[PDB]
Design a protein around this ligand. Structure first.
Ligand SMILES: CCCCCCCCCCCCCCCCCC(=O)OC[C@H](COP(=O)([O-])OCC[N+](C)(C)C)OC(=O)CCCCCCCCCCCCCCCCC
Ligand SMILES: CCCCCCCCCCCCCCCCCC(=O)OC[C@H](COP(=O)(O)OCCN)OC(=O)CCCCCCCCCCCCCCCCC
Ligand SMILES: CCCCCCCCCCCCCCCCCC(=O)OC[C@H](COP(=O)(O)OCCN)OC(=O)CCCCCCCCCCCCCCCCC
Ligand SMILES: CCCCCCCCCCCCCCCCCC(=O)OC[C@H](COP(=O)(O)OCCN)OC(=O)CCCCCCCCCCCCCCCCC
Ligand SMILES: CCCCCCCCCCCCCCCCCC(=O)OC[C@H](COP(=O)(O)OCCN)OC(=O)CCCCCCCCCCCCCCCCC
Ligand SMILES: CCCCCCCCCCCCCCCCCC(=O)OC[C@H](COP(=O)(O)OCCN)OC(=O)CCCCCCCCCCCCCCCCC
Ligand SMILES: CCCCCCCCCCCCCCCCCC(=O)OC[C@H](COP(=O)(O)OCCN)OC(=O)CCCCCCCCCCCCCCCCC
Ligand SMILES: CCCCCCCCCCCCCCCCCC(=O)OC[C@H](COP(=O)(O)OCCN)OC(=O)CCCCCCCCCCCCCCCCC
Ligand SMILES: CCCCCCCCCCCCCCCCCC(=O)OC[C@H](COP(=O)(O)OCCN)OC(=O)CCCCCCCCCCCCCCCCC
Ligand SMILES: COC(=O)C1=C(C)NC(C)=C([N+](=O)[O-])[C@H]1c1ccccc1C(F)(F)F
Ligand SMILES: [Ca+2]
Lengths: 295, 49, 100, 48, 819
């Protein structure tokens, strides 16, 4: 591009730069690790000296970004620095860093503070073996596209079925008579209850089954709208606590029908699906081994 | 004649006719429910109890 | 009444499917039976819950008749539809709705 | 000085016992509700 | 010496695997008066055959390279216990090094040392993919330390051990969410730390949704890769009356004989129904006692099983164990069913393949159990209240506070309790590690081994947070690596007994047939036929379907939700009749998708008229409007192709799923017999929802255990301490005698069996499909040969065989890969 009037830094660019910026980003990772998160605006001594250290780590990466940006075009000039694959990531990193660091000393919140955990990704840039390893997974997840478009649609179908069948059913429970305390037993978790139905009537002596109960898992597991129904369907599909949802529906509406909904979702959603991905990926491994066996 | 005069479709169309007759009688035979408050035994149906 | 109407409309297609090589006609007929069956079941529902809103209760004779007619019609329509629908291809060339 | 370290936490207690052992006082730990009664009536032992 | 040197290592193993808690003193005496002598006997074997192999050949083979390490560590450790090296943790972390000598029987087997010749290179080559997993874990722990760090400060008294308060704890939490165990409770704590089930809070679920899926995926991939490559190395380097009447009538009567075992009542001894099946038993027995002579009056290994079955059905017409021996009644169907015995024997020949990888795993399990006994033996005791740290202090009563309210307390007697899964011997250690390797209850063993204080004292919160390493290596070796090379073993072995593309296409271009299109005459009805198959029309149909789907999601809890239902019902029933008129009810019912559409339309009509009949005066008829977006699978040809491809091979192998249903049947009957009288009390794991009283309930319990739920808690809900059901029969005062300690043999076996057969069904269905999965989608294939079929049936509305010559101009419409 422009003449060699600005490239006063391309002389030490080819020095062993990797064996110093790697140790710097590793020390940055360590200073990120030993940080202690304290509740409600509290801090200690070591947490104060680790924010003065984010000025030594944000000033090295930034001057190296300058050294690499002006050594190749104004910004790109041929899509050189910015459009280099693993040089845009580092730019966003050191461009959010300074941004939020000067923002923290302009109102003198913590949302952009959490973008500080992307700096550990720089180590992948540091070693090219990791760079080629990381690009193989995004190369092998394209055959898993017709499986994801099937899992998404199955989750959306079962969410709507559960929204039609169970919406607003797990809202009664048995409190103590005249109280707002749920009445349970030693290891029992608060489950739904039924009055005038095939559901469960609860047994504790001074207890009555009335409504106004936010739901089973503090109000998180229920088919009350599309978002929560999607959430509980997805949770069941991972085969984690699906029997709890089944049992709560059994307590709410009745024992004989609801299993059809959950044994079908666990067979189709979990076993059939994981069997699909265990075949599609092993087939991809086999074909990428066979194409290389001819080399 | 593959699906229409095979034996495996005729056995099923046989099994259908049993359901046909038992259903056309079930609408008319009120012999499926009793109630006894407690001698006033009842017999429910679809049209008249 | 709707269930018996479905049985009526299904027997027609079940019989007209025997002539003129109208085998395709056995595909809708089956389905009608299914709904008939299904209808019978929800019929059950109503009566059942009525029995538990009126004392003792007990189903003696015709509940078996209905619980048999429903399951037979339902399973038979489903299996008739499975037998009229040709086959899952099972081969890279075979296909559903293939020429004879 | 009587110092009390309350709760089940991961913080350093050395300085608190030092404040206790230096100024003629005592150091108590209250991890739960069941310890409150007996640990809050025991300073009368030191005062005596 | 080839066997005398294995005799000494076996004598040493049987002595290091006999150290338990509270062992007799003579046992402690034996265990070291048999260690110094055996260490010196390991010393003579590093001298005489050292001198036999000269000078420099005791460093050429890595085999005897670490054997000098054994002697160095042994003597150095002998002289460090006569020193101030106390702190039993320190004295025992060398007795774990003492275990490093068992590798002398692994020293001696060919195939047990041949497999590691590339298994060790597996990690070494993949060390840059395992590192990406480590970096993923570290980034997600550093993100969890920001989102939920110091935010689990709920005022209640309930302990939440899996938090993100510091970096080791965040690592433990992220690893536990990765293994999948109890991740939903971590998510619930994360949701309650924020607002709650509201708009700000619930978005913190995304974190977990990204941590599980994209975290499982990567991991899985890595392991799979490793497995396949390491297995290739171990597979390529080594490479270089007698009619149908009788049989079909007896076969349909063994199923009745079996289902008479299903329908039963274990609680009611002779229930009103039970003697009906007792009478049917004589019928099902005497129809079989005749056909044992119609088979061996014509004649004099598989029918002796049947004769024993009928003999035990005759002698029955303590001894009550014989009633468990009548569960092989369906095991005789492997006689007549010929396709059944083929897979029953293909499974017994597939077990011989996996016998090499089971012994190395069992040995790793044993050695990790020994390390566990050296670490956490005696340390899994506790008191009811966690303020008393000794069995002598844990006496009397204490108060418990409900909901953590200091003004609402109850009295509870305090008792010195032992954990249910502990590390006192190698049997208990192996059981604990077995429950850990299935990922169930492993955080409760972790946070209990972290609090381990001393040999007979109670826990201390966050005492030893480094103990987590013991639980994170074992999980990575056994549950992530050995289990994955087991699956790689079975998949690569199935791979073989399963050119090719030319063969497939020359078979295609022979047996394929033409396709019918139903292109009609009569331009007056050809008019509506033209607007029926327009891409614009079907795209309007697809858009209407997605509009109905988005209208189905708008419903919530606490009327324009039914008028639109009727409006869509009308749109679809008019589309159906218009398609019918354009196809004359002959081309319409030819397409299965049109059969499904007709099904949906009839169901929707019935639903709307039922709802307005109900408002003029069925919860499942409302499901037919949801089934509509299934016909959205008539457009996505890749998804439809994948679904058909897998459903084909799932239908091709029903005799491998028959094995699973037989396993479930047998185990459910045996469990109804063994533990079927236990009470149904809430707060326990045998309750109204999960029990053994009836056959459906037992089958659903076994399905829950198959899915790997808290099966190790049902295993403890049936162990000779359980209150009997009041309806049962038992002597007074003799109540807590239900349940048997046979549960450990019942569950541990079942899981294993249920994990084998399932894996089997996963591999067959995969290898039967290895054509479509290992296919280059560009070079060649049947998709082009279906392109040809389509463009050919275009010119040929009715099949009528083949077609005219010119319309030869079609060859200009083909892709160059084929045209
Ligand atoms: C994406 C490709 C395919 C993905 C999905 C493929 C299939 C789609 C999912 C299948 C639907 C699951 C079955 C519905 C769940 C029923 C639960 C239930 O009935 O309880 C609630 C309700 C309980 O509600 P309720 O009526 O008691 O509540 C109020 C009480 N009253 C009204 C009395 C005041 O049960 C019913 O309404 C009756 C249902 C009985 C009949 C339904 C069972 C048959 C359903 C279809 C069978 C097909 C099986 C699966 C197909 C194969 C797919 C793998
Ligand atoms: C390489 C693999 C990559 C890994 C993939 C990662 C998946 C990303 C997850 C995406 C999640 C999207 C969430 C965005 C929802 C928008 C937020 C919102 O407004 O909805 C709130 C919702 C309902 O409203 P709410 O606030 O609860 O109601 C209170 C009264 N107003 O309240 C809620 O509860 C919203 C929560 C919805 C969460 C649904 C989760 C189900 C989706 C998982 C299925 C995907 C399976 C992937 C399989 C692919 C295989 C490789
Ligand atoms: C794709 C990959 C994997 C594929 C591999 C194939 C293996 C599949 C294995 C999965 C089996 C899951 C079985 C789940 C069915 C359980 C039924 C159930 O839980 O219903 C409970 C309900 C309770 O009623 P009850 O016990 O009478 O008491 C209440 C009375 N007021 O009971 C009822 O009200 C109705 C009871 C009738 C239900 C019968 C239908 C199923 C029952 C058993 C089916 C299987 C039979 C043999 C076991 C084979 C299963 C493998
Ligand atoms: C009951 C009614 C029938 C169920 C839906 C009918 C749709 C159908 O089964 O069509 C066949 C479909 C693909 O078959 P085809 O295109 O012929 O594949 C040959 C390519 N070598 O094969 C498939 O169905 C693929 C799997 C989709 C099944 C959808 C389930 C719909 C029924 C619920
Ligand atoms: C086998 C000989 C190695 C035994 C080493 C050992 O005792 O393991 C200790 C470790 C838990 O660490 P810990 O002992 O608590 O740390 C002491 C700091 N106070 O727990 C462990 O790491 C035990 C497992 C370490 C290696 C066992 C098998 C390794 C096989 C491939 C790796
Ligand atoms: C990677 C980069 C992702 C980092 C994004 C995290 C920062 C965005 C959320 C900012 C935040 O933490 O809080 C904002 C807001 C207020 O929350 P706060 O004030 O802490 O407490 C309640 C008081 N309103 O929050 C709320 O009021 C409700 C909670 C907001 C939902 C938080 C969003 C979590 C989603 C994280 C997904 C991470 C997955 C990607 C992982 C990246 C891997 C490199
Ligand atoms: C078999 C599996 C083996 C398990 C390997 C786990 C490795 C241990 C991780 C480091 C560790 O355990 O401690 C982190 C420590 C900072 O935390 P610390 O000071 O211990 O906090 C005290 C809390 N009261 O010390 C650290 O901060 C080290 C954390 C390193 C994070 C950055 C690493 C950058 C690249 C990652 C690869 C190394
Ligand atoms: C590559 C594969 C993976 C790719 C990743 C994709 C990730 C997507 C998964 C995340 C989706 C979860 C969305 C969660 C939010 C749902 C809406 C919601 O949160 O609230 C429910 C809302 C009403 O709730 P409420 O707040 O009570 O309203 C009034 C309150 N007084 O009611 C609503 O308004 C919600 C209505 C939405 C209904 C939609 C149902 C289906 C629509 C999609 C079908 C089209 C398929 C996409 C086509 C793509 C083809 C390639
Ligand atoms: C190199 C050496 C050569 C040796 C090779 C021998 C190979 C044998 C491999 C078998 C697998 C063993 C792994 C199981 C872990 C051990 C379980 C155990 O020992 O349990 C201990 C239990 C008592 O423990 P505790 O908690 O103290 O309670 C006592 C109160 N009664 O006491 C018990 O009652 C437990 C009873 C154990 C029952 C085991 C049943 C296993 C049957 C599985 C067969 C199917 C496997 C094939 C499929 C594999 C595919 C994955
Ligand atoms: C016997 O080995 C074992 O102790 C096993 C442990 C400890 N855990 C579990 C879950 C097993 N299992 O049967 O699924 C086997 C295991 C585990 C990893 C690889 C192979 C096997 C094998 F045993 F099945 F071979
Ligand atoms: Ca689990």
């Amino acid at each position: 591009q422009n003449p060699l009037r600005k490239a006063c830094i391309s002389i030490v660019e080819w020095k062993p730069f990797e064996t110093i910026i790697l140790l710097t980003i590793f020390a940055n990772c360590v200073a990120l690790a030993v940080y202690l998160p304290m509740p409600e605006d509290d801090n200690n001594s070591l947490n104060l000296g680790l924010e003065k250290l984010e000025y030594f780590f944000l000033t090295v990466f930034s001057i190296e970004a300058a050294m690499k940006i002006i050594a190749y075009g104004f910004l790109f000039h041929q899509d050189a620095y910015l459009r280099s694959g693993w040089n845009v990531l580092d730019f966003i990193i050191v461009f959010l860093g300074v941004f939020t660091a000067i923002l923290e000393q302009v109102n003198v919140v913590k949302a952009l503070r959490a973008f500080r955990v992307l700096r550990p990704l720089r180590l992948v840039s540091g070693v090219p073996s990791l760079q080629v390893v990381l690009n193989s997974i995004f190369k092998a997840m394209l055959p898993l596209f017709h499986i994801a478009l099937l899992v998404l649609f199955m989750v959306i179908i079962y969410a709507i079925i559960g929204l039609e069948l169970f919406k607003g059913k797990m809202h009664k429970t048995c409190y103590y008579i005249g109280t707002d305390i749920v009445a349970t037993v030693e290891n029992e978790k608060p489950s739904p209850c039924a009055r005038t139905g095939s559901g469960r009537p609860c047994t504790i002596n001074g207890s009555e089954c009335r409504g106004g109960w936010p739901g089973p898992n503090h109000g998180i597991t229920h088919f009350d709208n599309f978002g929560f129904s999607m959430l509980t369907v997805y949770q069941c599909i991972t085969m984690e606590g699906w029997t709890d949802v089944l049992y709560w529906v059994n307590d709410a509406i009745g024992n004989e029908w609801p299993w059809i909904y959950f044994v079908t979702l666990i067979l189709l959603g979990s076993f059939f699906i994981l069997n699909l991905v265990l075949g599609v990926l092993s087939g991809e491994f086999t074909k990428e081994r066979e194409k290389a066996k001819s080399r | 004649m593959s699906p229409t005069e095979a034996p495996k479709v005729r056995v099923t169309l046989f099994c259908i006719l049993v359901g046909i007759v038992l259903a056309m009688t079930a609408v008319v035979s009120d012999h499926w429910a009793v109630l006894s408050p407690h001698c006033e035994a009842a017999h429910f149906g679809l049209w008249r109890i | 009444v709707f269930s018996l109407g479905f049985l009526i409309m299904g027997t027609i297609c079940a019989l007209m499917a025997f002539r003129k090589k109208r085998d395709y006609l056995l595909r809708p007929a089956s389905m009608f039976y299914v709904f008939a069956g299904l209808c019978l079941f929800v019929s059950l529902e109503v009566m059942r819950q009525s029995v538990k809103r009126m004392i003792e209760y007990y189903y003696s004779w015709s509940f078996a008749c209905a619980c048999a007619a429903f399951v037979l019609l339902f399973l038979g329509g489903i299996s008739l539809l499975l037998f009229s629908l040709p086959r899952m291809p099972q081969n890279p060339w075979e296909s559903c709705m293939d020429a004879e | 000085v009587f110092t009390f370290s309350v709760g089940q936490h991961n913080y350093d207690r050395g300085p608190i016992q030092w404040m206790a052992c230096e100024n003629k006082g005592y150091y108590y730990e209250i991890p739960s509700i069941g310890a409150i009664r007996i640990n809050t009536q025991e300073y009368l032992d030191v005062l005596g | 010496f080839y066997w005398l040197v294995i005799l000494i290592v076996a004598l040493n193993t049987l002595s290091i695997a006999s150290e338990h808690h509270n062992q007799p003193l003579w046992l402690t005496h034996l265990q070291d008066i048999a260690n110094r002598v055996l260490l010196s006997l390991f010393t003579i074997e590093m001298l005489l055959k050292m001198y036999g192999l000269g000078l420099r050949q005791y460093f050429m083979s890595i085999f005897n390279r670490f054997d000098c390490f054994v002697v160095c560590s042994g003597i150095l450790e002998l002289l460090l216990v006569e020193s101030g090296a106390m702190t039993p943790l320190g004295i025992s972390v060398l007795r774990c090094i003492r275990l490093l000598r068992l590798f002398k029987i692994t020293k001696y087997w060919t195939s047990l040392s041949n497999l590691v010749a590339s298994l060790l290179n597996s990690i070494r080559s993949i060390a840059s993919l395992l590192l990406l997993l480590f970096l993923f874990i570290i980034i997600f722990a550093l993100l969890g330390m920001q989102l939920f760090g110091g935010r689990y400060d709920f005022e209640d008294t309930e302990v939440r051990r899996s938090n993100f308060d510091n970096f080791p704890q965040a690592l433990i939490s992220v690893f536990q969410v990765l293994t999948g165990e109890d991740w939903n409770s971590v998510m619930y704590n994360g949701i309650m730390a924020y607002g709650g089930p509201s708009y700000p809070g619930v978005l913190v679920c995304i974190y977990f949704i990204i941590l599980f899926v994209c975290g499982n995926y990567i991991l899985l991939n890595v392991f799979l890769a490793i497995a396949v490559d390491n297995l290739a190395e171990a597979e390529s380097l080594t490479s270089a009356v007698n009619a149908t009447w009788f049989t079909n009538f007896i076969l349909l009567f063994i199923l009745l004989s079996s289902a008479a075992l299903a329908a039963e009542d274990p609680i009611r001894a002779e229930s009103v129904r039970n003697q009906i099946l007792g009478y049917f038993d004589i019928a099902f027995t005497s129809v079989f006692t005749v056909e044992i002579v119609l088979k061996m009056t014509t004649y004099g290994y598989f029918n002796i099983l049947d004769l024993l079955v009928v003999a035990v059905s005759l002698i029955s017409m303590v001894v009550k164990i014989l009633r468990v021996l009548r569960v092989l009644r369906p095991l005789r169907a492997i006689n007549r069913a010929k396709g059944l015995k083929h897979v029953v024997q293909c499974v017994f020949v597939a077990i011989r393949t996996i016998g090499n990888i089971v012994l190395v795993t069992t040995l790793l399990q044993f050695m990790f159990a020994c390390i566990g006994v050296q670490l956490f033996k005696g340390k899994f005791f506790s008191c009811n209240d966690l303020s008393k740290m000794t069995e002598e202090e844990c006496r009397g009563y204490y108060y418990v506070y409900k909901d953590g309210d200091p003004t609402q307390m109850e009295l509870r007697p305090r008792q010195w309790i032992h954990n249910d899964f502990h590390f006192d011997n190698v049997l208990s250690a192996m059981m604990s590690l077995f429950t850990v390797s299935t990922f169930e209850g492993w955080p409760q063993l972790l946070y209990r081994a972290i609090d381990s204080n001393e040999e007979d004292m109670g826990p201390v919160y966050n005492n030893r947070v480094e103990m987590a390493i013991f639980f994170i290596i074992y999980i990575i070796l056994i549950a992530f690596f050995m289990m994955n090379i087991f699956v790689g073993f079975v998949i690569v072995t199935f791979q073989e007994q399963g050119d090719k593309n030319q063969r497939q296409c020359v078979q295609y271009a022979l047996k394929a047939r033409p396709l019918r299109c139903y292109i009609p005459k009569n331009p007056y009805q050809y008019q509506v036929w033209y607007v029926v198959t327009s891409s614009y029309f079907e795209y309007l149909m697809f858009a209407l379907i997605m509009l109905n789907t988005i209208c189905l999601g708008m419903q919530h809890y606490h009327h324009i939700s039914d008028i639109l239902n009727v409006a869509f019902t009308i749109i679809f029933t008019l589309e159906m009749i218009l398609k019918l008129l354009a196809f004359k009810a002959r081309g319409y019912f030819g397409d299965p998708w049109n059969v499904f559409d007709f099904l949906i339309v009839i169901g929707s009509i019935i639903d709307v008229i039922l709802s307005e009949i109900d408002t003029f005066l069925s919860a499942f008829f409302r499901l037919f409007r949801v089934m509509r977006l299934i016909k959205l699978l008539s457009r996505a040809e890749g998804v439809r192709t994948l679904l058909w491809t897998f459903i084909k091979s799932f239908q091709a192998l029903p005799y491998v799923a028959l094995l699973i249903v037989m396993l479930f049947f047998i185990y459910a009957v045996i469990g109804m017999q063994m533990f079927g009288k236990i009470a149904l009390v809430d707060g326990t794991q045998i309750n109204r929802n999960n029990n053994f009283q009836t056959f459906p309930q037992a089958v659903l319990l076994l399905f829950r255990c198959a899915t790997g739920e808290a099966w190790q808690e049902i295993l403890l809900a049936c162990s000779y301490g359980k209150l009997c059901d009041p309806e049962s029969d038992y002597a007074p005062g003799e109540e807590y005698t239900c349940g048997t300690n046979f549960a450990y043999y019942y569950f541990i076996s079942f899981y294993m069996l249920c994990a084998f057969l399932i894996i089997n069904l996963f591999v067959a269905v995969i290898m039967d499909n290895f054509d479509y999965l290992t296919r280059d989608w560009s070079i060649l294939g049947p998709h082009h040969l279906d392109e040809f079929k389509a463009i050919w049936a275009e010119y040929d509305p009715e099949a009528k065989g083949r077609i005219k010559h010119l319309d030869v101009t079609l060859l200009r419409r083909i892709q160059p890969p084929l045209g």
